[PDB]
Amino acid sequence: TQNPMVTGTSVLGVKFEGGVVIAADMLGSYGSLARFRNISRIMRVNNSTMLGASGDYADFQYLKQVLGQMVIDEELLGDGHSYSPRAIHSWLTRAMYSRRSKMNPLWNTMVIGGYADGESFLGYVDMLGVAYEAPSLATGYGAYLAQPLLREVLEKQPVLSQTEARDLVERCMRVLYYRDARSYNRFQIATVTEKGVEIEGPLSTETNWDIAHMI
Amino acid sequence: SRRYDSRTTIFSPEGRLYQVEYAMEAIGHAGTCLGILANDGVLLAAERRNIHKLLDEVFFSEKIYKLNEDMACSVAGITSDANVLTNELRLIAQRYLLQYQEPIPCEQLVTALCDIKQAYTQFGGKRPFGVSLLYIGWDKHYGFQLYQSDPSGNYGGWKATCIGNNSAAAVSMLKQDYKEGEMTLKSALALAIKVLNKTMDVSKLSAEKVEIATLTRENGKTVIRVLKQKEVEQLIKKHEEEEAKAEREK
């Protein structure tokens, strides 16, 4: 892919006590045009891991097709094994690096949140094969805007509960609605626990416009 | 898969070949040809195996295959096995001319064919060629030349030759009546009429059953001559006159 046609935007993610919460919005844009107002940008991998992505959306449907097949392939064996969230993060890194080595990359930026064996996992995947782990991740302009809000609380208090982490994402998604030119007031929140993967509905923020009277 | 193979590649338990000897005995039947040079010019003798009176004979050319502006050949064996070889050897002589812009010498053209005929005997189990043939030609290095070919890929230089099994007795005549450089081109022609008189068991040597093609050197043209049917007949009547003349001593 040389030119991304229909693109996504920033995706957030942060660990908490016994789970990882990931939120992203529901807009696909073609340049300055907000063309597709209602799409899903979060894929629920089987039971303990979870994927969101930015960048080109047509490439995201391709990886949604491939990863969806591989999970079915192990379940049909039925030997009592599964892919860990780290193994998918390891697999997806080699997929990106081999793709860019042929000078024909996949224009994406992917965030993997997982929770297995009582361990919250949060992994980053770049288009250029750059991958790491972090207690809080942000893509796009969220790495410029929401990422200072994430690291400020986590360096003050390292651990978080579920309600503290869920409220803190809604504050960062509010800020991205103000300062990002290509955002939208309709987002969905996905959360892994030990009970499984649950995806919330099309939530929205509440803005403040009291400074408009100040000339 | 494995029991259907014919194994035309293994040697004989005697320690020789086994399939080529079967092929070389087909050449002796179905055809009889020869050629003779001793001076400027060279002839080729042919024989009509099928002489039925409902053929067209509209090719106006025959077993003499003019493969070059300086060379031709006379073939005997399986008939359309030659048409693979004549079209192939015609193009070897022509790709040489593309490479050098100079006509092909008669020696190394024969070596090009004999490497092809050997290659089916070396490897594969492909059926080998049941084809032996002759060569006539002029070059810048030795002039007029004759060459015999074999199905085995063997060749050699000759001055009087043989193909057919009936012409094995002609070799006994060619040892008896050959000269050393006295080929006036009537003595060479009356000898060839004398050979095919005794060898070919068809009586009186009808002019339609045989064929003669000659190659003479012009100033720079190398005229290849396929002589017509009228002058065959006066050459036969010349040879019949010499037989009636020579029997006067008895």
């Binding site: - | 293994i10 320690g15 050997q118 490897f123 189990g125 060749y155 230089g157 000759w158």
Partner: protein, 239 residues
Amino acid sequence: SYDRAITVFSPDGHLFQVEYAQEAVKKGSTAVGVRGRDIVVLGVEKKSVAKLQDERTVRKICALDDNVCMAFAGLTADARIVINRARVECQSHRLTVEDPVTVEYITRYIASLKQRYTQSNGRRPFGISALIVGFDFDGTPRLYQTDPSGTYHAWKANAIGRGAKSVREFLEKNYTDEAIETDDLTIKLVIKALLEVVQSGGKNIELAVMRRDQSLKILNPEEIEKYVAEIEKEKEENE
């Protein structure tokens, strides 16, 4: 594409096809060759000309380079592929390393070519056995031989063809260094040895020498009459 093996093992532990093609070498004409200290010599026998035909095309002694000379047995067509292959390799060796080709190098090329030509699938072996004579740099004359198995092998005198062991038995009682002293005596040595071959009436003997500083020079059919004359004169002193 022909995926079928020709040469396999026998229950007694031998190969069929290698010891099955050496009889074709035994049905060829004989050609012997010795070496001196300065002039090598090799002579084919059994010319068997048709006495009215050409002879410059039935040559059984050729050269790969200006150093190396050939002589073989077996069938005619298989030698032509091996010779025209080895002319390419000895000339491509000079395109590499700029020396002339040593005579031991070209025998390893032929024997390795003939070995994989039996190891592979769907391929008849060759049926020839060559003599390779050369006097390389430093001027040391030596000769080798081949085999349809592909074993290069250095001798001081060789005999092949139909009647090889009889001529080798003649040289077996002929180990004299005095015959390798004079050059014309060494040529008369081969002419006496080729006289033990079939009829050898001075006409079927085609010999060729090389004085290690010159290309191969075939003796004319007058020195063959001259050397057979002095061999008859040397045989007359038996009384």
